[model samples]
Target: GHHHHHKIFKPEELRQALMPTLEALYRQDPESLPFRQPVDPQLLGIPDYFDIVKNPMDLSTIKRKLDTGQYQEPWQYVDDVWLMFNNAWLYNRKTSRVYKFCSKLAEVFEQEIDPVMQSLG
Candidate 1:
């Protein structure tokens, strides 16, 4: 008899898989704004907002999944990306650049990524 074992999906695994792809997109795309330089540790008051690159999940509740070793559904990754974009929009409102970035990010998520992710399920 052959044994079949299923692999469990972990939040860290998805996060690891997506970050490189997203980071590359963030850099290569003209519309995606770079994360703020000289980020102050205390500026946003939220720990995740301090490092948008490494910290994808903005909501503390959802972010806790990583700390608790809980399995994250694919949608959570989508939420994570949204939050990162939202953080950029919120803290960097002094310039139109961040606005452009947010608009483009939403368009990409809705038009490009969401369909592919939904079909995967």
Candidate 2:
């Protein structure tokens, strides 16, 4: 009689193998991602990007904070705003909501964040 064996994976090995798919899924359905959570502006002591609706004048300060890397995960800032755009666009199809500064900021995020992260990899 013979015994059969099964393969087991270490956490790092699993993570390494799964990262690309996980990244794609996170981009596609961020809200459904397990690691997704609310960002606390007060906890980080950073300017609230959401406050743009309340006070558009705060835009400059928010941009500065993002540019200077005030948070640990700055791309998360972009990802959050991107989701906001995604939601507005989906709910209000063919509406002008997405054509506003939201699109510009998302473009900036792609320009500034993606290259840095790519180079780091």
Candidate 3:
């Protein structure tokens, strides 16, 4: 038998832990407004969107997953936010609307998630 002191959270507990970080990210921060929802390349007439962005991520998509209980662990939520930031940098130029906004918002996600992240591996 293996003995361990670590505690594993239930799905409900994980969701509860993950929500505040997300809420604090784009909802309250003015600088984070642009990243709060999905990006529409066609609407903006941005070319090569799907070509470059292989895996798209957005707050709306992540929030939906949390509400629908799609996340089985804390890391999945963290991963989505990381993906969102990475996609922004890849598709948009530096200091541009999407790139700059995501740079700021990513800091929020990183800073706010400390408590939850510390609880995981």
TM-score winner among the candidates? 3
Where in model 1 is the C-alpha error above 4 Å? 1-24, 36-71
lDDT of 1 by residue, 1-121 (tens): 1112233566676555444435544553666535423344576465755454444333343344544645365555566557666666665664677567666756655555544454435
Predictions in order: lDDT: 0.52, 0.39, 0.78
Write model 3 residue lDDT over 1-121, tens digit each, in one string.
Answer: 1112355567788788888888887575576666667788889797788899989888889888987888887777888888888988888899687688778887777778876677664
- For model 2, how many clashes? 0
TM-score against native, each model: 0.48, 0.31, 0.85
Cα deviation of 15, candidate 2, in Å? 28
Q: Which ten residues in a row have the lowest lDDT in candidate 3?
A: 1-10
* Candidate 2: tens digits of C-alpha lDDT, residues 1-121: 0112233434444334333332432353323222233434467474743553332222233334444544344344444445544543443335443344344444544554454444333
Reference-based TM-score, model 1: 0.48
Model 2 spans with C-alpha error above 4 angstroms: 1-70, 95-112
